[PDB]
């Protein structure tokens, strides 16, 4: 298990392997954090989250 096949490449959401390295991305409505891994909701009621 390497890159994306290894625990989703440490990504919160989408994982891609470019030039032998992991590249994380996020669903619409989220922005990729400064760490290049976590996905931060851009506003209220982001997709895929149960409501509180």
């Amino acid at each position: 298990r390497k890159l994306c096949s290894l625990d989703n490449g440490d990504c919160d959401q989408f994982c891609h392997e470019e030039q032998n390295s992991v590249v994380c991305s996020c669903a619409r409505g989220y922005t990729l954090a400064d760490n290049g891994k976590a996905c931060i909701p851009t506003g209220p009621y982001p997709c895929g989250k149960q409501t509180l």
Partner: protein
């Protein structure tokens, strides 16, 4: 839904219900955005005029979150035919935008390669709806959800009396008494990953409900991501 559990407060916020002229549900849907609902192509043959209801968990009480929306545009897949049930997918554009709130939020659309490698290889997905509680019963007045295992594609093809196309996938149980059922079709099949729920399927068809040696057949959403994207721009 046969078996499973009640969707508790806020747990199934992307559930949509297609309601007929008599305000009764006949098919499910998944909220994709403020303007778009995902459903099954075959549901567009079950009523002449229909609307969409969101934010409902109990059809016998006013919880305060319910909203009914008129449909502006119906976008059926042009390759769907009732004969095969292939390309069983449609998007609906609403006349007015859905205001998100408690029990009303969209499910995320995933990327194809990642979803097929990572989501569709998880143990289970989640199906939900207001459909029948038994093959020979009434529709549920309560929104229900059910964890359904992904089923090995070979095993599914051998269990089926009809052709399982590249646009379909199987989920559910061999003999365990749990499955989607009548009235759930068009509804959500979602897969959880790090507490985020992604659209992975549309309740499509079954040879009955929860029968032994039979599984639920779902439209393989991942095969239609470019198509959904195109439909949501026009």
């Amino acid at each position: 839904i046969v078996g499973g559990q009640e969707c508790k407060d806020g747990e199934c916020p992307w559930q949509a219900l297609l309601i007929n002229e008599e305000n009764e549900g006949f098919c499910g849907g998944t909220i994709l955005s403020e303007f778009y609902i995902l459903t099954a192509a075959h549901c567009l043959y079950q009523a002449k005029r229909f609307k969409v209801r969101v934010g409902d968990r109990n059809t016998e009480q006013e919880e305060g979150g319910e909203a009914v929306h008129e449909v502006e545009v119906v976008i059926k897949h042009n390759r769907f035919t009732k004969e095969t049930y292939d390309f069983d997918i449609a998007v609906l554009r609403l006349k007015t935008p859905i205001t998100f709130r408690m029990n009303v939020a969209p499910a995320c659309l995933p990327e194809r390669d990642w979803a097929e490698s990572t989501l569709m290889t998880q143990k289970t997905g989640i199906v939900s709806g207001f459909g029948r509680t038994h093959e020979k019963g009434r529709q549920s007045t309560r929104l229900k959800m059910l964890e359904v295992p992904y089923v090995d594609r070979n095993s599914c093809k051998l269990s089926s009396s009809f052709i399982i196309t590249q646009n379909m996938f199987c989920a559910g149980y061999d003999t365990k008494q749990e499955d989607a059922c009548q009235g759930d079709s068009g509804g959500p099949h979602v897969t959880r990953f790090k507490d985020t729920y992604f659209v992975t399927g549309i309740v499509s068809w079954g040879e009955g409900c929860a029968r032994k040696g039979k599984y639920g057949i779902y439209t393989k959403v991942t095969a239609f991501l470019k198509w959904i994207d195109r439909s949501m721009k026009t």
